[PDB]
């Protein structure tokens, strides 16, 4: 090799992380991004679910 | 310390907590749905 190697030919790092779901831990949720919190007002709320 | 040998194949991990405890400890352990409950 070389610290120029082209394309091709030079070291090409992998991760290849696998999705699984079973009767194993099914530890899945959502991109649920924290957002403010607002009293005295008719509102939507989603507390943990 | 007589307990084990080895423990080769792992799965989940959990060591924490370093808190302690004429007195009584009740204790209660159920499993549902792979989820190990304990009182």
Known sequence: ???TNGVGYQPY???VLSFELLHAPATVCG???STNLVKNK???FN??? | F???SSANNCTFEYVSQPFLMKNLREFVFKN???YFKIY
Do not use: H, T
């Open chain 2, 2 to 4: 007589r307990v084990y």
């Open chain 2, 32 to 34: 549902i749905d792979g």
């Open chain 1, 42 to 44: 008719c509102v939507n």
């Open chain 1, 31 to 33: 991109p649920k991004k």
């Open chain 1, 1 to 3: 090799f070389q610290p």
């Open chain 1, 47 to 49: 507390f943990n679910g």
């Open chain 1, 13 to 15: 790092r992998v991760v």
